[PDB]
Design a protein around this motif. Structure first.
Motif, PDB file in Angstrom:
ATOM      1  N   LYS A 102       0.923  -1.142  -0.024  1.00 15.05           N
ATOM      2  CA  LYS A 102      -0.051  -0.042   0.024  1.00 15.05           C
ATOM      3  C   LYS A 102       0.844   1.022  -0.054  1.00 15.05           C
ATOM      4  O   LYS A 102       0.484   2.023  -0.817  1.00 15.05           O
ATOM      5  CB  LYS A 102      -1.137  -0.086   1.270  1.00 15.05           C
ATOM      6  N   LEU A 103       1.762   1.214   0.916  1.00 16.02           N
ATOM      7  CA  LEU A 103       2.745   2.333   0.783  1.00 16.02           C
ATOM      8  C   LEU A 103       3.331   2.568  -0.406  1.00 16.02           C
ATOM      9  O   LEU A 103       3.738   3.772  -1.050  1.00 16.02           O
ATOM     10  CB  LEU A 103       3.869   2.190   1.969  1.00 16.02           C
ATOM     11  N   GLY A 104       3.785   1.681  -1.035  1.00 15.99           N
ATOM     12  CA  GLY A 104       4.367   1.716  -2.323  1.00 15.99           C
ATOM     13  C   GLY A 104       3.447   2.317  -3.287  1.00 15.99           C
ATOM     14  O   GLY A 104       4.001   2.937  -4.154  1.00 15.99           O
ATOM     15  N   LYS A 105       2.427   2.097  -3.259  1.00 16.21           N
ATOM     16  CA  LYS A 105       1.351   2.855  -4.374  1.00 16.21           C
ATOM     17  C   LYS A 105       1.504   4.344  -4.201  1.00 16.21           C
ATOM     18  O   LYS A 105       1.475   4.935  -5.216  1.00 16.21           O
ATOM     19  CB  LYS A 105      -0.236   2.567  -3.867  1.00 16.21           C
ATOM     20  N   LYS A 106       1.626   4.851  -3.044  1.00 20.21           N
ATOM     21  CA  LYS A 106       1.966   6.384  -2.951  1.00 20.21           C
ATOM     22  C   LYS A 106       3.288   6.665  -3.876  1.00 20.21           C
ATOM     23  O   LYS A 106       3.329   7.736  -4.154  1.00 20.21           O
ATOM     24  CB  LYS A 106       2.015   6.526  -1.317  1.00 20.21           C
TER      25      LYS A 106
END
Length: 14
Positions: free
Chosen positions: A5-9
């Motif tokens: 999820k953090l990667g999506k940012k």
């Protein structure tokens, strides 16, 4: 760290 999820940012961050 950076989770899926953090990667999506980051993937979204240009």
């Amino acid at each position: 760290i950076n989770w899926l999820k953090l990667g999506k940012k980051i993937i979204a961050s240009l």
